[PDB]
Amino acid sequence: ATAKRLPLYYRFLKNLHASGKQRVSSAELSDAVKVDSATIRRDFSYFGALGYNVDYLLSFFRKTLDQDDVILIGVGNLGTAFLHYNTKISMAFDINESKIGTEVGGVPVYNLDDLEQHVKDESVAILTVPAVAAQSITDRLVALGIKGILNFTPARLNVPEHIRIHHIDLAVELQSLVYFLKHYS
Amino acid sequence: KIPQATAKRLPLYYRFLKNLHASGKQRVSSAELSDAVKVDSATIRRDFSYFGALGKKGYGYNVDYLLSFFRKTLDQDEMTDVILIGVGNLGTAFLHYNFTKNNNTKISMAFDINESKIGTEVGGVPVYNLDDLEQHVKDESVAILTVPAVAAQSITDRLVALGIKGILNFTPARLNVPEHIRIHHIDLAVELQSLVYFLKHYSVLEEI
Ligand SMILES: Nc1ncnc2c1ncn2[C@@H]1O[C@H](COP(=O)(O)OP(=O)(O)OP(=O)(O)O)[C@@H](O)[C@H]1O
Ligand SMILES: Nc1ncnc2c1ncn2[C@@H]1O[C@H](COP(=O)(O)OP(=O)(O)OP(=O)(O)O)[C@@H](O)[C@H]1O
């Protein structure tokens, strides 16, 4: 639970640091993030913060996050390239019963039907299915609390704005490069 | 070298012919062509020799023939033919990519070193031996790299020598190329690590 509160603090203190403030009280933080005074002080003791030093905490939060994941849907050429490319992909999903129940790149392939039961804490999804499948899958992912999607499909996804989408597409990349070549060469 | 002056006249001829064809006109003379682009009949003869356009004495030029001829010529000139190197998982996904018509871009050929793939067609694109790269590449300006990182640089040196001006690098290799060469580097692993980083830190990962 402490690690679910740490992000709330990190977000606010980032903002605080941005506005110049070198110190923060447990009451300031409580009002800003709606965690009670006492829980904050208890957490900050556990973080070794002895007025609290804003930079101490931000540095602590940042190191913690860096010291301590991902699912993939569509185990075809692109997905396999990803499962073989050289932050662990822990589970993959497909609809091909030939692939369901095998491991590719050491990662087990499950039935898409099991997505809701199997996904718990994972926050990142790689999407390597045909564009036609992408929106319905994305809708299910956002419902299961996935927070970022690597969309390696031609589909332009409809998502809440807080869902981070990294869109990778061959035609989109090529359009841009060709434009440069045709205009700035 | 088709002369610049000739090459610049090609879209002019085409626009003129477009209008003639819409008007129901069946034949066009050298003089009518000359009036259209403001040159003389001898220029038309020379320009048409450079384009390979054919007429019949007296009759002149068939408007339908010439319009489709000039359209086929402009389409080819404006098409982006792309070369792909490395027909593994990633490269075969790309050779199966369906580019829309609106987009005159296609992958025209591919190269590999695997004997089982060389001499085959994948998504309608022929797969050739990398050794023959210099004998297949003529005017193509864009290449896609989907080879292991350790092979990417030697290949890139060859491409830039053959006149490739732009590369999509889907490999981990950080490529060394002259200043004018345009590269987009897409490392799939790094793209994944970037998404994970942002969700932890709400700032964008510094790469390299
Ligand atoms: N609705 C879906 N949910 C999950 N996976 C899917 C869905 N539709 C397709 N896939 C999977 O996405 C992958 C990519 O689909 P695609 O049709 O491009 O196959 P592919 O890469 O050519 O590979 P293969 O030749 O092995 O089918 C395949 O493994 C396919 O089974
Ligand atoms: N120097 C090279 N020039 C051209 N192709 C190469 C070169 N080196 C490796 N390749 C090819 O690049 C492609 C991608 O390499 P990789 O080792 O990732 O194979 P892969 O994606 O696992 O595909 P597959 O399972 O079909 O071998 C392969 O088709 C391989 O045969």
Swiss-Prot record, chain B:
InterPro entries attached to this UniProt entry: CoA-bd (IPR003781), NAD(P)-bd_dom_sf (IPR036291), Rex_DNA-bd_C_dom (IPR009718), Tscrpt_rep_Rex (IPR022876), WH-like_DNA-bd_sf (IPR036388), WH_DNA-bd_sf (IPR036390)
Residues holding NAD(+): G86, V87, G88, N89, L90, G91
GO biological process, one term: negative regulation of DNA-templated transcription
Species the sequence originates in: Bacillus subtilis (strain 168)
Family, as annotated: Belongs to the transcriptional regulatory Rex family.
A GO cellular component annotation in the UniProt record: cytoplasm
NCBIfam families xrefs: PRK05472.1-3, PRK05472.1-5, PRK05472.2-3, PRK05472.2-4, PRK05472.2-5
Keyword Cytoplasm: yes
Locations listed in the record: Cytoplasm
UniProt main location, coarse: cytoplasm
The protein, known as: Redox-sensing transcriptional repressor Rex
Keyword Cytoplasm in record: yes
Protein function: Modulates transcription in response to changes in cellular NADH/NAD(+) redox state.
GO MF annotation terms: DNA binding; DNA-binding transcription factor activity
Keywords attached to this entry: Cytoplasm, DNA-binding, NAD, Repressor, Transcription, Transcription regulation
DNA-binding region(s) from the entry: 12-51
PANTHER family noted in UniProt: REDOX-SENSING TRANSCRIPTIONAL REPRESSOR REX (PTHR35786), REDOX-SENSING TRANSCRIPTIONAL REPRESSOR REX 1 (PTHR35786:SF1)
Subunit and interaction comment: Homodimer.
Lineage of the organism: Bacteria, Bacillati, Bacillota, Bacilli, Bacillales
